[PDB]
């Protein structure tokens, strides 16, 4: 039978005995990403070019306000916003939800692959809403998941049921599940990380990518991908297997890319997908957040090639 | 002023003289790469998954080989997606050779990854009867060329004489705008575009080159790295920020990967129009004369000054 | 606040403590919709024309498909099916549901607006279902509306709530709610039915046409509008008030218009919104079938144009 | 095989030996078209609504129409049902046109939702003179093409030229004119008429009799079917698909009909006379009438022309 999210969330829903506000959450998520992707393909750009005579931005606040208007949030943060987004008191619902509304967009002038990121967590206190609410740890997810706005647009979408994948058909504004249940390969082939910054690599890092250049053995090399946009690189990396890597190094030795609203996500649908994600000293999910902003490294996909990165990471230390 | 593809081709046209024929095909090709990108994005998949109870490269190859029959402008097709050229039957037979791959990077798309249409288009040249060697033509003979970027948004970017343009397709109204004119590429950018994958197999001068890159002997700041394995999706990035991309031979290629005909002539063709630069490392890409239409070339192609420097970086290994 | 059909039916049953099945339905409804007016639309026509080398028919597979698929129907009535289908018992849910899912597509070769109308009803019986529980009063319905294929797509709900309607943004698939609880106005000033039957009228429609030509209180004359499509002549009744008749006549001494798919879901929309729906001698709602497929005359709208009918027929007894 | 708009003018024009102008004001005309679609669809109508935290369509159709046909460089003056005066192009963008249109007809009722549509006709600029508003005042019978798109059901442009009538299904996945219906000829005879009866009390003598021969036929034949929509485009395509007659005839309160000349009435008979079918204002041919006022109004009966003599025979009964 033909799943759409909206019918796919309200059973889990049902089986749950839940009171829908969860469902209601992801579908006013759900709008907000069919516009975005409405946005990124560009629909209307004529009129900007005069025809009758900021995208991330946009985006931000149409995941801002099609969360608060869900009756279903507390607590937003996001990427493009210095301090959390306390939901007025006649809105606020049970669930905080981080997200980067637009990743990928600082290069989108060359229509590079851009993505929506998210993780929703239950307000655990009763304390009035703030920002210590989202200061928990990505084993507390309660969903994660992204959309990518690339060839198509997908929404990836775990939570304890597993990972499961849904194509908006444009042409109806529907996400259809195409891919149930999705696992990832214990063993891949593709390595991506920044390899420019290579003189910057910390001793394991530049170890770990040599051995996948020059195996020590008769395998083959990986190959490397690299997008530079980490929607892309870990949707990638979920589908085929392999290893992403954005690691820490002495000038940046908590990494660069942001725990709440990108590792957290990222590390949790890899998890959900029986991946791994470290930051190298311990599971990206177990970081206990201090700063909404905080940064911290992951190395995430295929359980036997972080395992392997965490064999040489551990010869240098 | 506001401009489509469908006026700006048109007014180049009457500019020249011309009596259309190009225009034609440049109309057809865009009415196929609609298609495609509507395909692409997965408009009516939920048809597919039974919501009322071909292959994607398949469909882009009979879209644009149709649309260009139809278009009464051209004798000879040569498609990624045939093993041999398809010869345009004579009621419909135009004068122009067109070169394309339909879908390029099609093998990922599975995971999403940027992909896109390929063209050069050819004036025949021999009075023979049309066949496979009416393709068989260099690079520089090219009447333009382009590509369509399915990526975030689906951009056309077109190379002629009159240089380079990039029209923005605007899914609303089924138009491409004109939003950027007579580009020009940076002349020596920042970023770096290979796959590394192959560094146990890559030939003395790129060993150097990239080292250049990542260790620069000047203490300048390193280039950064992308390659996004989607030859239309890296070009298109090292045409709007400048930088190299490069694919040179490796042992499972030993004449290169990328084909000469319909990936690396009409990437070199926008890049020379764009003020850039594209070699296989001997010679120009465009001044190739090629034998086979499925034949291979290595290329290195993008803003010119570091384009040079991999030759200088060539030329020290001879 | 923004709100789609999604959320207002979510939040709808959420204050109602319902157990979501009913929203189920509606989903699937509007999904539905959606990939109908796609097709009405004729998105992707190129392709029967050879690019690369039944209408009715669809819209039916679409609704009955959608509908089958919500586990929340157990017995579907449509125009285009000569007997009542009965839902698999592994996706049986407790509504029935008579539709016509392109009312008006006889015509569609002009372009003419065309529609889709739905009534729901709960199984009221313990038995096994069948055609039988889908001969209910129209007083019955859990909740009626219809989607219009006009200039552009509007669904129109009406529920115990009230009528809501919703505007199809097909930029990005969502129903946005633009007019909230509708009320049609007391008294309008077009009156619509096709007088190429005048030769056929029963006296009391052919008096009161003459008074909406020659008003006998010095009021100026009704204008006259006939799309010849139910759904579009029903909205515009709907929408600028007024009054749209089907009658009897010596084709159809019972009307032409079909009584559970077609007189029924528009005269509850009428009665939701303040208006009337009446066959002359009594409220269609109150019609008790004995057919799936019987026929009702209908006059409808505004309530003080219906009831100056109604005064005209009862002078003629 | 397949033929767009796009392609079908080309090739007229290459057969035509033109030099391409007129092509590029209707693939011009075709792109506002697809826009106005567009918006008409209501596509972004979440924008207003505040999904994120504002014309009427029909000035914002006119804006369409104007700034594209002045951006093809093929038109030098533009009549408007928006705009008191004609439109004069500025120099640098001068082409040999005349364009009247009617860019959303049909809009007052949109509220409904009834179908709406856009309305064209198309002159060559017959003077040498300064461009002005007086190369707009020909008759119909000098129109070089026109026709309208109808945004119902689904959207599709008839264009009517010397080589007849074609019709072309606007797919909207991919922003192309599909040729569906090609050379299009209306039916002899219809089974259909289409006027607003509300107000039969002013009804001319004429057209009283008339619409009683269609309901009450004094030969036993089958009554008529009526439809009107209130939207001209509308129920002019039915009237040209089906067959039949479409009245917006004069009376005592309005001796001119209430409908324009240049770019409602001139178009669509020119549409008509292409494919068989007649249009009169009851005393001479819609496309004969010689214009004193770019908005000046104009009775029109249009339709299969067995229908339209029948209407003639009881207008010249009456004197
Ligand atoms: O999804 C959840 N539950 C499923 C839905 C059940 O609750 C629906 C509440 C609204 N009620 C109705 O709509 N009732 S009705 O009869 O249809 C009705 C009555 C009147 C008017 C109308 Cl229009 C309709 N729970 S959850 O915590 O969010 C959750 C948990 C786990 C995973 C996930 Cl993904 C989500
Ligand atoms: O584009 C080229 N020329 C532009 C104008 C071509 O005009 C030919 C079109 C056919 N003619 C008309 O349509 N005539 S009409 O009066 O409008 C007419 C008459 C009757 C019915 C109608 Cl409906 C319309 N030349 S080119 O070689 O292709 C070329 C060269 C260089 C760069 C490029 Cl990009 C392209």
Do not use: W
Request: charge should be neutral; hydrophobic fraction near 40%; aromatic fraction near 8%.
């Amino acid at each position: 039978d033909v799943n759409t999210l909206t019918r796919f969330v309200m059973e889990e829903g049902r089986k749950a005995r839940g009171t829908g506000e969860l469902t209601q959450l992801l579908n006013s998520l759900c709008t907000a990403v069919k516009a975005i992707s409405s946005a990124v393909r560009k629909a209307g750009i004529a009129h900007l070019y005069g025809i009758a005579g900021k995208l991330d931005v946009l985006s931000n606040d149409l995941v801002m306000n099609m969360l608060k208007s869900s009756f279903a949030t507390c607590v937003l943060v996001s990427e493009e916003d210095k301090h959390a987004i306390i939901v007025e008191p006649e809105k606020r619902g049970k669930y905080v939800v981080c997200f980067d509304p637009l990743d990928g967009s600082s290069n989108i002038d060359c229509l590079v692959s851009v993505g929506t990121i998210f993780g929703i967590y239950r307000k655990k206190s009763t304390d009035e809403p703030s920002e210590k609410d989202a200061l928990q740890p990505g084993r507390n997810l309660v969903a994660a998941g992204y959309a990518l706005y690339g060839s198509a647009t997908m929404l990836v979408l775990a939570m304890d049921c597993g990972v499961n994948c849904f194509m908006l058909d444009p042409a109806i504004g529907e996400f259809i599940l195409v891919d149930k249940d999705v696992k990832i390969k214990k063993k891949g082939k593709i390595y991506s990380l920044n390899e420019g910054y290579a003189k910057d690599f910390d001793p394991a890092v530049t170890e770990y990518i040599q051995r996948k250049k020059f195996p020590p053995d008769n395998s083959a090399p990986y190959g490397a991908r690299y997008v530079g946009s980490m929607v892309a690189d870990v949707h990638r990396t979920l589908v085929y297997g392999g290893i992403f890597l954005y690691p820490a190094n002495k000038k940046s030795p908590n990494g660069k890319l942001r725990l709440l609203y990108e590792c957290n996500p990222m590390a949790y649908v890899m998890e959900k997908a029986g991946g791994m994600a470290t930051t190298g000293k311990e599971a990206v999910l177990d970081v206990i957040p201090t700063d909404i902003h905080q940064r911290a490294p992951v190395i995430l996909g295929s359980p036997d090639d972080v395992l392997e990165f965490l064999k040489v990471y551990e010869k240098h230390s």
